[PDB]
Structure formats: structure tokens, C-alpha cells
Amino acid sequence: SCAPTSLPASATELPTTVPTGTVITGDYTGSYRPQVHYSPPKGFMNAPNGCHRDRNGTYHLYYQYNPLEYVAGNQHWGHATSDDLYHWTNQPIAIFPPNSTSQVFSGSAVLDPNNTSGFFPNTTDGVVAVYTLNTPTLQVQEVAYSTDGGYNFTPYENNPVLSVGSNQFRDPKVFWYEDHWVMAVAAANDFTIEIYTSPNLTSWTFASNFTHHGLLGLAYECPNLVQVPFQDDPSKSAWLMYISINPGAPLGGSVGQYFPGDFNGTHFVAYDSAARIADFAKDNYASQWFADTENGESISIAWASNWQYTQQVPTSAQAFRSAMSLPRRNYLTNITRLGWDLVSLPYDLSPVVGPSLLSSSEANSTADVDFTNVTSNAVWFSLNVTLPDAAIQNASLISADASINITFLPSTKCSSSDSPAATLTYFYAGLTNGALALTRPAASSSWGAENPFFTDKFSYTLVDPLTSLVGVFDRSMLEVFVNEGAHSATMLVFPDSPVGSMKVATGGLPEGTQVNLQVNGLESTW
Amino acid sequence: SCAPTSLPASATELPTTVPTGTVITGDYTGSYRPQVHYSPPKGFMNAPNGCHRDRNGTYHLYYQYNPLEYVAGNQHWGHATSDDLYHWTNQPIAIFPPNSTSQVFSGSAVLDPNNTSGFFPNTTDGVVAVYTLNTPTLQVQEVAYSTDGGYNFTPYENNPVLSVGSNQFRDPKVFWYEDHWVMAVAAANDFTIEIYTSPNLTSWTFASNFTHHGLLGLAYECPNLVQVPFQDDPSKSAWLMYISINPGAPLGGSVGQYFPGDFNGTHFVAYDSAARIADFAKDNYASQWFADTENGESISIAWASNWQYTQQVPTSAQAFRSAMSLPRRNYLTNITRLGWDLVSLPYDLSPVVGPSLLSSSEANSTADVDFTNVTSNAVWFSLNVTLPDAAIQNASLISADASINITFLPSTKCSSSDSPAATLTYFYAGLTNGALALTRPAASSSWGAENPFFTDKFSYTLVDPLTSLVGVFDRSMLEVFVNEGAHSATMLVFPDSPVGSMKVATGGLPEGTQVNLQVNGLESTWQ
Ligand SMILES: *[C@@H]1O[C@H](CO)[C@@H](O[C@@H]2O[C@H](CO)[C@@H](O[C@@H]3O[C@H](CO[C@H]4O[C@H](CO)[C@@H](O)[C@H](O[C@H]5O[C@H](CO)[C@@H](O)[C@H](O)[C@@H]5O)[C@@H]4O)[C@@H](O)[C@H](O)[C@@H]3O)[C@H](O)[C@H]2NC(C)=O)[C@H](O)[C@H]1NC(C)=O
Ligand SMILES: *[C@@H]1O[C@H](CO)[C@@H](O[C@@H]2O[C@H](CO)[C@@H](O[C@@H]3O[C@H](CO)[C@@H](O)[C@H](O[C@H]4O[C@H](CO)[C@@H](O)[C@H](O)[C@@H]4O)[C@@H]3O)[C@H](O)[C@H]2NC(C)=O)[C@H](O)[C@H]1NC(C)=O
Ligand SMILES: OC[C@H]1O[C@H](OC[C@H]2O[C@H](O[C@]3(CO)O[C@H](CO)[C@@H](O)[C@@H]3O)[C@H](O)[C@@H](O)[C@@H]2O)[C@H](O)[C@@H](O)[C@H]1O
Ligand SMILES: OC[C@H]1O[C@H](OC[C@H]2O[C@H](O[C@]3(CO)O[C@H](CO)[C@@H](O)[C@@H]3O)[C@H](O)[C@@H](O)[C@@H]2O)[C@H](O)[C@@H](O)[C@H]1O
Ligand SMILES: *[C@@H]1O[C@H](CO)[C@@H](O[C@@H]2O[C@H](CO)[C@@H](O)[C@H](O)[C@H]2NC(C)=O)[C@H](O)[C@H]1NC(C)=O
Ligand SMILES: *[C@@H]1O[C@H](CO)[C@@H](O[C@@H]2O[C@H](CO)[C@@H](O)[C@H](O)[C@H]2NC(C)=O)[C@H](O)[C@H]1NC(C)=O
Ligand SMILES: *[C@@H]1O[C@H](CO)[C@@H](O)[C@H](O)[C@H]1NC(C)=O
Ligand SMILES: *[C@@H]1O[C@H](CO)[C@@H](O)[C@H](O)[C@H]1NC(C)=O
Ligand SMILES: *[C@@H]1O[C@H](CO)[C@@H](O)[C@H](O)[C@H]1NC(C)=O
Ligand SMILES: *[C@@H]1O[C@H](CO)[C@@H](O)[C@H](O)[C@H]1NC(C)=O
Ligand SMILES: *[C@@H]1O[C@H](CO)[C@@H](O)[C@H](O)[C@H]1NC(C)=O
Ligand SMILES: *[C@@H]1O[C@H](CO)[C@@H](O)[C@H](O)[C@H]1NC(C)=O
Ligand SMILES: *[C@@H]1O[C@H](CO)[C@@H](O)[C@H](O)[C@H]1NC(C)=O
Ligand SMILES: *[C@@H]1O[C@H](CO)[C@@H](O)[C@H](O)[C@H]1NC(C)=O
Ligand SMILES: *[C@@H]1O[C@H](CO)[C@@H](O)[C@H](O)[C@H]1NC(C)=O
Ligand SMILES: *[C@@H]1O[C@H](CO)[C@@H](O)[C@H](O)[C@H]1NC(C)=O
Ligand SMILES: *[C@@H]1O[C@H](CO)[C@@H](O)[C@H](O)[C@H]1NC(C)=O
Ligand SMILES: *[C@@H]1O[C@H](CO)[C@@H](O)[C@H](O)[C@H]1NC(C)=O
Ligand SMILES: *[C@@H]1O[C@H](CO)[C@@H](O)[C@H](O)[C@H]1NC(C)=O
Ligand SMILES: *[C@@H]1O[C@H](CO)[C@@H](O)[C@H](O)[C@H]1NC(C)=O
Ligand SMILES: *[C@@H]1O[C@H](CO)[C@@H](O)[C@H](O)[C@H]1NC(C)=O
Ligand SMILES: *[C@H]1O[C@H](CO)[C@@H](O)[C@H](O)[C@@H]1O
Ligand SMILES: *[C@H]1O[C@H](CO)[C@@H](O)[C@H](O)[C@@H]1O
Ligand SMILES: *[C@H]1O[C@H](CO)[C@@H](O)[C@H](O)[C@@H]1O
Ligand SMILES: *[C@H]1O[C@H](CO)[C@@H](O)[C@H](O)[C@@H]1O
Ligand SMILES: *[C@H]1O[C@H](CO)[C@@H](O)[C@H](O)[C@@H]1O
Ligand SMILES: *[C@H]1O[C@H](CO)[C@@H](O)[C@H](O)[C@@H]1O
Ligand SMILES: *[C@H]1O[C@H](CO)[C@@H](O)[C@H](O)[C@@H]1O
């Protein structure tokens, strides 16, 4: 009746030697184990790597993987595949360190259909991985190739392909621009993204530096240079430099930021000197965009944790630490006053959407949704609010108490007290007009209350009224999307008791305000 | 006796009409009332305004003041004076709105000793206030002058002195540059600081725009363009554009940010495109630098609150809402890797420093300091940690458990739950190496736990090891300064029970590590 809080030792015990060419079996039943998010069968996972789509339409996810412990280290590339970015199949480890004292750090993977590399005389489905090898004294860029569709990789003969004599030089993102390969790589502790060019992915020539932009934190990491379409006009696009920083994010630890601008194949130039943060909570880092997607599609995935507590979260008794974000569709838009904005929406959820739990059109009411019978313990919800045009043209018509309150409440059935696991509060007017508060109350979680970095409360302030809100709760994760993904937050929750229900309350809304609420159970992908 | 948690209605009841030419009496005895920070006798206070030092060395603090309510509105300039920025004397209201439908928003004040303005034919001690007047439809810059040393102000005859036909155009900061006046003013919702020039403070000419720099939030506010000396070399200085943003700070609501650069009298040019945040917590906003200070002394003060909860904090039963930060001495330094850094240190605390409560040289120990006998309920502490040169040249010598833990604990004597009111945790090594955590636990405060914006936990990560930590606790406020003020945080606390003691624990420190801990009670400045 209740998901296990602890698993048998056979499920959690890690091997003392790394398995080659065999899939690692995982038990995906833990009470904190997400059912629609990727997480590794066992061990520690961080940043996504080598994200690309085959011509056969299979999505390849690789990731920083420690197969020997529940903390960072011994980095290999784990591998999982999906046709829909929700139903994941675990694959054997894809990239190994040469020995016990070296590590495979982050990188990217590209299709080389025209065999510019020379690794692929007999296939048009060749994959090239470009990644950082970490030694005690250096970080260098290395190349590996795969003829079997990205499952098994062979080291390049003349590795390494790029060194600057530094041990802070990592996370290469390779892509095709017109007539050559581009590499974005971080000179991490110099707050510089170095852009290199190559015709064959093995011989790299310096092109330009992008330095000391936006928030510095303590290091630039996981650079992504991508073309992102406009939300309102698919035919228009702009280039985006996305940079992860860790430590030293404003909320503490790790965070991503972005710069809209122009790229001409050698040089990126930001449109302005403004700093812009992607997510208004703490648990979204090291976004990578999928290479070789179908026309127009900006698809990204991120690691749904924070370096300040990722190695301490109480999920190791359930055979894992860390999960990816929902896969995201990305756009650029202009929002009122602020201008440039990175839009993030969940990638098509239809394959995991189960039956309706509640449909309601009631304004100024409270809706109670029990989902103790939803075995996934995962729900999707949508809330649309349409203010009368009177209230839109004159905001002072709105009463000070006009609000939306969403609370996730502990199960009575599966228990061990009454604190919500998660809250969302939005005010249309009053003293905190446009303020959205997202909380994981300290009282709900013994582990959370004690961890000195596990921040309880997050906020974003809208200029425009809240018109749309989409949410996914998945056992130990809440993701929310506001105003068609204009604003986005990823938040981990570790409540003592599993979530059994949610309450959605609207109050003090102007006469003629329309409210539409839909809640659906999600189907487990494991 | 224990400090009262509620005051008599005569102490908290506000008048229905604004008093002119009379000092408003305050009761400064409340359990949350700071004893070494400025707060208004009663009513609601926000941003500091018109901050300047007169030639006789008196510091003038003005502030955004609602004399009629415990929330924002009806803005006047309140006034207080000090010789030392700790012993404050309340003064009558200094600037009034012309009528019931207008408000006096933020601004600055300058000495005009050479009478460039023409207001001062018979004095060299003339003060000029330049401030935003808010009407329902416009924000315009106005001038007022004072011949009595900044206590009573007269409107300029030909007000306003600057309009752009906007209702989002405010917070002028005026200063002398070589041979002319400069005004920095915010085109708030366009994320632009407009720089204007004037020979007489009444006629303003556009010079330049500084636009879309750093964090945008929802508005640019309270610009300050100041020359800040180098911490290591007083003969060197650089210009700093300091901008407040609200709402839309990363931690929510309000925060300040800065840009080191060059100013040539017309144009400010940032040295780089980097964004830099001043304070790593939530309760420091609208910093203003004092005009006409001695030498190159950079002196600032800020409002110690956050717009997300400032109007809801549970201090109105004690006749006030909001307090200023400690006054601060400012410098520029280079810190390892990050480079440019705004240094913030408490302005000379010696006039409020009372007797020693503890001096200890013990490493790897826990010191318990009771201060239930300190009537101010305010303490200063200094913690110096010197790692051996061995640990400096090879960091892997430091054990994963090498840490500093400071907890402020509720009084047993003045009880209204055992949770600390505030914590500071620093790790030298391990999985979160260099991470400093500052917390106001939800369990300590019923009001705090319920407020959806009152964040419990804040952090900054050092590259260099922590060598110095200075702290001031003052009833409802904690300020911490790290590595000679390289990093700074201001945090409000509203514990159910007043703080009675602090514990300082060091642990796991390398052999030969020196620790020096000093704790002193502070003397109340309110007589
Ligand atoms: C494109 O950008 C790249 C990346 O910025 C440029 O390459 C860098 O060039 C700069 C000079 O402009 C180099 O910086 C110098 O480094 C010297 C050596 O310092 C190192 O060695 C020291 C002693 O062993 C060591 O203490 C130091 O570490 C410390 O400083 C770090 C500074 O960030 C700090 O993070 C650490 O915590 C630590 O305290 C260094 O490892 C130094 O003597 C000079 O004063 C100067 O700082 C960088 O090393 C280069 N970086 C890389 C990786 O290439 C390149 O020039 C640009 N190219 C073009 C064409 O524009
Ligand atoms: C120095 O900086 C100030 C402050 O930025 C600047 O004044 C501003 O100028 C801008 C641009 O003219 C003004 O913006 C306009 O505002 C009106 C509404 O009153 C809008 O209708 C205009 O919209 C157009 O541009 C939009 C851009 O998003 C488009 O969406 C739209 O389709 C229109 O084409 C436009 O936004 C702004 O109001 C003023 N602000 C103030 C406070 O005066 C000044 O011009 C700069 N001076 C110099 C010399 O550079
Ligand atoms: O080199 C010493 C350091 O190595 C490991 O941490 C490395 C690096 O990991 C993180 O960076 C990213 C992004 O999160 O993660 C992969 C590696 O897993 C990198 O390619 C990528 O930039 C952190 O963000 C960095 O702070 C850190 O330097 C090891 O696990 C550490 O314990 C440490 O010893
Ligand atoms: O103008 C309409 C606006 O008036 C009031 O809010 C004004 C303004 O107050 C704050 O700005 C600063 C800095 O905090 O405070 C003073 C005013 O006391 C300004 O000179 C300065 O920029 C807030 O930060 C702003 O967001 C706010 O606009 C009133 O309280 C509002 O409801 C509104 O009517
Ligand atoms: C957001 O707005 C900016 C400014 O209005 C847009 O940049 C403009 O792009 C149009 C064509 O789409 C040009 O005609 C203008 O000259 C540009 N303005 C400036 C000053 O650069 C930008 O395209 C918009 N972005 C999105 C995502 O809609
Ligand atoms: C921090 O370091 C920077 C970089 O060295 C210093 O900037 C230089 O300052 C010197 C003298 O002031 C100039 O001669 C150089 O041309 C400057 N270089 C750059 C790139 O700006 C800066 O002075 C230092 N700041 C502090 C506070 O020490
Ligand atoms: C491990 O591999 C790295 C990278 O090739 C190499 O530099 C190092 O010498 C190897 N270690 C040993 C002990 O062979
Ligand atoms: C890549 O091309 C460059 C010059 O075009 C050349 O130096 C290098 O040998 C090439 N590498 C391969 C493996 O073809
Ligand atoms: C791209 O533009 C930069 C200047 O912004 C220029 O120096 C560089 O050569 C350009 N590259 C190409 C290939 O046009
Ligand atoms: C908006 O309605 C308020 C009353 O709630 C009124 O005082 C104000 O003048 C109106 N403004 C406009 C733009 O109609
Ligand atoms: C909601 O309640 C408010 C206050 O009671 C009322 O004025 C308003 O008409 C109601 N709104 C709707 C949409 O029912
Ligand atoms: C809200 O409107 C959007 C428009 O795209 C629609 O997709 C969604 O079904 C609506 N949500 C609800 C709860 O009706
Ligand atoms: C209030 O005074 C301001 C500034 O002098 C003026 O613009 C406005 O007309 C006055 N309003 C009323 C209602 O008298
Ligand atoms: C006053 O005049 C003196 C020289 O006579 C000049 O040095 C100083 O800068 C002037 N001060 C102001 C504030 O105008
Ligand atoms: C001018 O100043 C002196 C000294 O302050 C004073 O005695 C005299 O009366 C003043 N005259 C005027 C016009 O104020
Ligand atoms: C200030 O000086 C300007 C230019 O010299 C002039 O236009 C203006 O009338 C002066 N104002 C006063 C009050 O002297
Ligand atoms: C100040 O610098 C700007 C550009 O940085 C220049 O256009 C302007 O003429 C300069 N003004 C003076 C007073 O030198
Ligand atoms: C602690 O170190 C500071 C410098 O950071 C020094 O000035 C101060 O005297 C030291 N404190 C004590 C009590 O020695
Ligand atoms: C640093 O100390 C470690 C042990 O803590 C030792 O193994 C290593 O050899 C030392 N390296 C240097 C810098 O001497
Ligand atoms: C301080 O508390 C932290 C947080 O739990 C702990 O990890 C550390 O070992 C403690 N050290 C001391 C000085 O008590
Ligand atoms: C502090 O204690 C640690 C172990 O907890 C010990 O290794 C070290 O020698 C001690 N250092 C000092 C300075 O007493
Ligand atoms: C997880 O927690 C449950 C109680 O909720 C225990 O039964 C189990 O042993 C594990 O501690
Ligand atoms: C996985 O965790 C279980 C329970 O803590 C252990 O039995 C096992 O040794 C491994 O640590
Ligand atoms: C502060 O607590 C005191 C108890 O001493 C009460 O008098 C007052 O109501 C407030 O709660
Ligand atoms: C202030 O008001 C409080 C009300 O809670 C009293 O309890 C207290 O004694 C004082 O009158
Ligand atoms: C000032 O606050 C006190 C205590 O809450 C009240 O007695 C008075 O009416 C006013 O609210
Ligand atoms: C404020 O209003 C009070 C009554 O509420 C009067 O007594 C007073 O004169 C002033 O008008
Ligand atoms: C002092 O002036 C103020 C504002 O003009 C008034 O509140 C009061 O009536 C007296 O005239």
C-alpha cells in the first residue's frame, strides 16, 4: 500500500569494480524516486552530457556518473535512451576513464553524417563525443567515436586534441555552424568562454573569448551556445549563450544564466550588458540542449539539484542520488518592461498523462484533490485565470486579498506532522502585488530543517497578472511554469510523510473572473 | 526586568495630523527595538535621504517617513542628527508635501559653501535638498534650501527643476565634480540612470544614459555615483555606480548591486559587463553615501528591511516599523579569483562598545556567552582564525570537519521551543568547502514561519579561507562582516523569545591554528 522508505541491501549495495557492457539494474520504487524524471538505477548522477537525437528519432541522454558511491567522483558517462524523453531505457556505461586516477568530465556529442572526422568510412550514423578528461594536474579536451549508434565509444588515437596547460578548462559544447565545427569551452576560474573552430573535430583553432559577463559566481561551467526560436513567431530566432555558475549563485551554490545575442561563427556579441537568471528556485543546473533535433525544436534538460546539498540528500537508502529536470521546449519572448526572456515549458507530457482527478470552473472556492490512489504519486495540474477587461485596464479595481494558494498535504494513509510539503501563493494586488512565493516548509522535513543550505522560500514578482500556471509534482520534485513558461522554478522536497493531496484556493477575485483547473494523475515510466 | 513585548497605546497611537516644528516622542524599550541602530520614534520609515556631514562635523540623516501609519505612504523627510552615527537625536520633520495629494520621495542634500545656487548670500553653511515630488500622474525633481543648517527648508520659487513628463523618474543623487554639479536620477522602469549637469543646482542639462546593466529586477532605484578608496592604498580610488532594484532581486523583493568604473564628469563607463551584489542576505536596501565627509572617507547607511515583508513585520506593537543598517565605512579591494569587491565595515563602534563578556584563545573548543545581564540585548563579537602556513600551502591538510558554528539561543529568564534565533556555519573543506551559511530558523519564530517571503537560509562561498568574522546582534537584527568586510550580510530576526546567549564552536582545525574570540556587550544609545 505504501512505497518503501528503505530498500534491500542488494538494491543499494554498489559494486567495488565498474561493470563494462552490462546494464546496471535499478529498483525504482523508493518513496522519493521520481516516476516521470530520469534518475540512475543506482549511484550518484550530476550534469547531463552528449545529449543528441539519432536520425531514427531515439533521444540519447548521457550523464556524469559515479558507479561506486553516492557522492561525486570516479566520473564516467552513464547512458539512457528514449523515443519521447519520458520512457527511459538504461544502457551500459558509454565512456570510461583510462585508469583509476582519471575522470571523464562533461562534454557534448554530435552526428557526423558526412564523415568530416574520418572515423566513419562505413556509416552515416557515426557519433563523436568531445569531453574533458580530468587528471590531478590537467583538464584537457578528448575525442571518442561510436559506429554502433552511441552505445560503445573508441578513444581517438592522438588524444588529447586541445590543452591550454590549465586544470580549470572544461565542458566543451560542439555544434555545426554553416561550414565548420564550433567548440564553446569554459576557462572556468577566469570567467571566460573560449570559442574554437575545426573542420574535422580533431584539430582546433582559437576564434574568440566571451569574458566577465553577468554573474561571475566562483566559476563559468557547462557553456551552451544555441539558436532559440521566438515563442510568438517560429520563423524568427536569436542566439543564446547559456552559462552555469557554481559555487557563488545568489541563492547559494549553483544556478544558470543566459545572454541573448548574435553569433557569426567565430564571435558571440550580447545585445546588452544585463544579467538574466533562468529559474527562480535553487534546483536547476547544467542545462544541455539536444544536438540534431527535428526542425525548429529547442529541447533542453537540466540536473535538478544544487551543489550545496546534492551529496547529502536523503535518497541513498533508496539506491540513488540526483535526477534530471523534466525535458523542456525552449523559446525566446519579450515580457512587459523586462524585455528578453528564456521561455521553458515541459516537453509534450501526453505519453505520461493519466486520467482526470479534478476539473473545476469555480472562482473564489477551494478544490481538494486526493491522489493517495495514484501509485506514481505524481500529478500534473493547469490553472488558467482570466480577469475581466475592466480589472486588466485598471488594476486598482482588484481587492488587496485577491490571491491563489496551492498546498501539497501529507498522506493520512502513508505516515511516519500536518505542515504542507510545498506551497505556492500569488497576490494580484495589495502590499506584495504580483509576488509569487514557492515554499518547502522546514516543519514538513526533519532533514530539510537541519541542512543549513536547504532554503525554504523562493519568489518571483510578475508585472503582468498571473493568467496561467502549469505544475508537475513527482514524489520528491515540484516544477512550476507561469504565463506560458515565461517564468519557471524547479524545487526538491523531502517531506517526512509522502504527499497525499493538494488544495487549490482562489479568493477575493474581481466579479466576472474565470478560473479553470485541471488535475491529472501521471503514469510511472519505470 | 524583561523588555516589554507590547507598549501602552499612548506610545503606539499615531496622530491624525502631521506635527510641524515639534519632535515626535518615541518609546525605545520594545523587545525588538534596536539600541545601536537608528529607527523612528514612531511610524513607518524606509530609504535614507539627504545624508551629509555639516562643517561642524554633525551627521544629518533624513529618511522616507509615514508619520500617520505603520505602512508606506504620506511620505515626508524625517530628520535625525549624530556626531558619531550611533547617538541619534530626533528632530522635527524637515520636508513636507505641498498638499494632501503629493509625497516627498527620495533625494540627496549637498553643502553649497561657494553659493553657486544663489540661495546663500550671507552663509557658507547653506544646505540644498534635491528630491522627487510624487503626484498621481508625475514624478519631478524639486529643490529646497536651508540657511539654519538643514533643520528647516524653503521650496525653490521656480520648482520643479527637472521633468521628463514621466511618473517613473526619481531618487536624484547630486554631487560636485571639479567645476559643476552632477545629478544621477533613475528612469526606474526603463532600467536607466540618467546623468544631468548644472552650474547652480536649478538648471539641469542631459549628459548621458547608463542603461540595462547587471540585474534589471523590475526597476532601477536610489542611484549613487561615488568615489571609493582602495582598502590597501588610501591614495588610490575608483568610481562606483550603486543601484538598488525592487522588486525582482534574486532572493526576492529588494537588493543593491554595484559597478566599478570611470566617471569623467558627464559619462560613467563600467570596467566590465559583470553584475555584482552588495549583501548576501535580504535585509539591506537603498544605501546612500554621506555627502561632504572628511578626507576620501566613504560613509554609507542603508535601510535594513525587504519590501516583500517590511510592512508586515511584528514591531508595530512596539511603536515602529523599520531600522537603518549600521553606518558603514566603504572601500574597494581585489579578492582572489573574483577581482573587484565593495568592502563594507561597521563605522567606528568604540562609542557603543561596553565591557568584555569573553576573551578566548582556545581552538577546537565551544565558548558559551550569557548576556541576559546586558540590558541593551546587543553584542559585538570578533573571531580571528589564522591557519598555519602548512594548511595555506596544501589545503588537503584540512580535515572535512574543520568548521565554525555560531548560534544565538533564546533566553530562559524572558521566555514567552529551544531553536536558535540565528546560526552561522562555515566549512574550511569537505563537500561544501568555503560555504558560509547564515540562518534564522523557522522553528524560532511563529511570524517568520508563516510569512511566505521571510526566507530562513542565506549563503556565500569564499575562495580564500575565513580569517576574520565581525558580528553585531541588536535585539531583532544580525549584521556579519567576513575577511575585513570583503563580504557582508544584514538579517532581521523576530524570535518568539529574546536571545539570551551565543555559542561559538570551532572544530577539526589543523594543528597550529590560532583562534581569537572577543565578545562585548553594547551600550544602548536611547536615553
Ligand atoms: C582568452 O581567455 C583566456 C582565459 O582567460 C586567456 O588565458 C588566460 O590568460 C590569462 C592572462 O590574461 C592567464 O592569467 C594569468 O595567469 C598567471 C598564472 O597564474 C596561475 O598560476 C599561479 C601560480 O601557480 C596560480 O596561483 C594561479 O591561480 C590563482 O589565480 C587564479 C586566478 O583566476 C584563481 O582563480 C585561483 O583561485 C588561484 O588563486 C593561476 O593558476 C598569472 O601569473 C597572471 O597574473 C594571470 O592571472 C590565465 O592563466 C589564462 N587562462 C587560461 C586557462 O587560458 C587568454 O589569454 C585569452 N586569449 C585571448 C586571445 O584573448
Ligand atoms: C535616456 O534614457 C531615457 C530612459 O530610458 C530615455 O527616455 C525614454 O525613451 C524611451 C524610448 O523613446 C521611451 O520609451 C517609449 O515609451 C513609450 C510609452 O510612453 C512607448 O510607447 C514606446 O514604445 C515603442 O518602443 C517599444 C520598445 O519595446 C515598442 O515595444 C513599441 O512598439 C514602440 O515602438 C517606447 O517604449 C521611454 O518612455 C523614455 N523614458 C523616460 C523616463 O523618459 C531617453 O530617451 C534617453 N535619452 C537619450 C538621449 O538617449
Ligand atoms: O577537480 C577537483 C574536483 O573534481 C570534482 O568536481 C569537479 C567539478 O564538478 C563540477 O562541475 C561540473 C558541473 O557541475 O560537473 C562536471 C564534473 O562532474 C564538470 O565537467 C562540470 O563543470 C562542480 O561544479 C565544480 O565545482 C567541480 O570543480 C570532484 O567531484 C570534486 O570533489 C573536486 O575534487
Ligand atoms: O509612485 C507610486 C507608488 O508610490 C509608492 O511607492 C513608491 C516607491 O517606493 C519605493 O521606492 C523607493 C526606494 O524603495 O522609496 C522611495 C519612496 O518612499 C522612492 O523615492 C524610492 O525609489 C518602492 O521600492 C517602489 O517600488 C515604489 O514605487 C507607494 O507605496 C506605491 O504603492 C505606489 O503608489
Ligand atoms: C524584443 O524586442 C526587441 C526590441 O523591440 C526586438 O529587437 C528588435 O527586433 C526587431 C525585428 O524583430 C527590429 O526591427 C528592431 O530594430 C529590434 N530592436 C532593437 C532596438 O534591437 C526583439 O526582436 C524582440 N525579441 C523577441 C523575442 O520578440
Ligand atoms: C584590481 O585589479 C585590477 C586589475 O589589475 C586593477 O586594475 C588596474 O589598476 C591599475 C592601477 O589602478 C591600472 O594601471 C591598470 O590599467 C588596471 N587594469 C585594469 C584591467 O583595469 C585594479 O586597480 C585593482 N583594484 C583594486 C581595488 O585593487
Ligand atoms: C591515467 O591516465 C591519465 C590520462 O591518460 C594519465 O595522464 C596518467 O598517467 C594515468 N595514470 C597512470 C598511473 O598510469
Ligand atoms: C584536420 O584538418 C586540419 C587542417 O585542415 C589538419 O591539420 C588535420 O590533420 C586534420 N585532422 C584529421 C584527423 O583529418
Ligand atoms: C564576427 O564579428 C566579430 C566582431 O563582432 C569579428 O571580429 C569577427 O571576425 C566576425 N567573424 C566573422 C566570421 O564574420
Ligand atoms: C481606476 O478605478 C479607481 C477606483 O478603484 C479610480 O479611483 C481611478 O481613477 C480609476 N482609474 C482609471 C484609469 O480609470
Ligand atoms: C469573489 O469574492 C469577492 C469578495 O467577496 C467578490 O467581490 C467577487 O465578486 C467574487 N468573485 C467572483 C469571480 O466570484
Ligand atoms: C489554459 O489555456 C491553455 C491555452 O493553451 C490550454 O492549453 C489549457 O488547456 C488551459 N488550461 C485549463 C486548466 O483549462
Ligand atoms: C499639490 O501640489 C503639487 C505640487 O505643487 C501640484 O502639482 C498639485 O497640483 C497639487 N495638488 C492639489 C490637489 O492641490
Ligand atoms: C568652491 O570653490 C573652491 C575654489 O574656490 C573649489 O575648490 C571647490 O571645489 C568649490 N566647491 C564647490 C562645492 O563648489
Ligand atoms: C549675516 O551673517 C551674520 C553672522 O551670521 C549675522 O550677524 C547677520 O545678521 C547676517 N545678516 C543677514 C542678512 O542674515
Ligand atoms: C542657472 O544657470 C543657467 C545657465 O547659466 C541659467 O539658464 C539659469 O537661469 C541659472 N539659474 C539660476 C536660478 O541662477
Ligand atoms: C567622457 O567620456 C565619454 C565617453 O566615455 C566621452 O564621449 C565624453 O566626451 C567624455 N566627457 C568628458 C567631459 O571628457
Ligand atoms: C582580529 O583581526 C583584526 C584584523 O582582521 C585585527 O585588527 C583585530 O585586532 C583582531 N582582533 C583582536 C581582538 O586581536
Ligand atoms: C599535501 O598533503 C597531502 C596529505 O594531506 C599529501 O599527501 C601531499 O603529498 C601533499 N602535497 C604537497 C602540496 O606537498
Ligand atoms: C558545525 O555544524 C555543522 C553542520 O551540521 C557540522 O557539519 C560541523 O561538523 C559542526 N562543527 C562544529 C564546529 O561544531
Ligand atoms: C583540532 O582537532 C583536530 C581533530 O578534531 C586535530 O586533528 C587538530 O590537531 C586540532 N587542532 C588544534 C589547533 O588544536
Ligand atoms: C523509512 O521510513 C519508514 C517509516 O516511514 C521505516 O519503516 C523504514 O524502516 C525506513 O526507516
Ligand atoms: C545501500 O544502503 C543499504 C541501507 O543503508 C545498505 O544495506 C547497503 O550496504 C548500502 O549502503
Ligand atoms: C508580548 O508578550 C507579552 C507577555 O509579556 C504580552 O504582554 C504581549 O501581548 C505580547 O504578546
Ligand atoms: C500591549 O498590548 C498587549 C496585547 O497583546 C498586552 O498583552 C500587553 O500587556 C500590552 O498592553
Ligand atoms: C499601537 O499599538 C498598540 C499595541 O498594538 C495599540 O494599543 C494601539 O491601539 C496602536 O495599534
Ligand atoms: C485628526 O483627526 C482627529 C480625529 O480622528 C482630530 O481630533 C484631529 O484634530 C485631527 O483632525
Ligand atoms: C505643520 O504643517 C504640516 C504640513 O504642512 C501640517 O501637518 C500641520 O497642520 C502644520 O501646518
Residue numbers in the entry:
A (entry chain B): 142 to 557, 563 to 672
B (entry chain A): 142 to 557, 563 to 673
Question: Can you list sentences taken from the study reporting this PDB entry?
Answer:
To analyze its hydrolytic activity, the inactivated D188A-RdINVΔ21–139 mutant was deglycosylated, crystallized and used for soaking experiments with different sugars, including fructose, sucrose, 1-kestose, raffinose or nystose, and, also, ternary complexes with fructose and palatinose, trehalose or hydroxytyrosol have also been pursued. However, only complexes of this truncated variant with fructose, sucrose or raffinose were obtained, the crystals belonging to the P21 space group with two complete dimers within the asymmetric unit that are essentially similar. To obtain the D188A-RdINVΔ21–139 raffinose complex, a crystal grown in 20% PEG 3350, 0.2 M NaCl, 0.1 M Bis-Tris pH 5.5 (2:1 rate) was transferred for 2 h to a soaking solution containing mother liquor supplemented with 30 mM raffinose. Diffraction data of D188A-RdINVΔ21–139 in complex with fructose, sucrose and raffinose were collected at the ALBA synchrotron station (Barcelona, Spain), being indexed in the P21 space group with four molecules in the asymmetric unit, at 1.86 Å, 2.38 Å and 2.27 Å, respectively. On the other hand, the sucrose and the raffinose complexes are essentially identical in the common portion, an issue that may explain that the specific hydrolytic activity observed on this three-saccharide is very similar to that reported on sucrose hydrolysis. Therefore, the description of subsites +1 and +2 will be based on the complex with raffinose. The glucose bound at subsite +1 is tightly fixed by direct hydrogen bonds to the acid/base catalytic Glu362 (through its O2), and to Asn387 (O2 and O3), with additional water-mediated links from both residues to O3. Similarly, O4 is linked to Gln280 and Arg311 through a water molecule that also makes a polar link to the O6 oxygen from galactose located at +2 subsite. This O6 participates in a well-ordered net of water molecules linking the substrate to Asn275, Gln280 and Asn308, with Asn275 being also water-linked to the galactose O4 and O5 atoms.
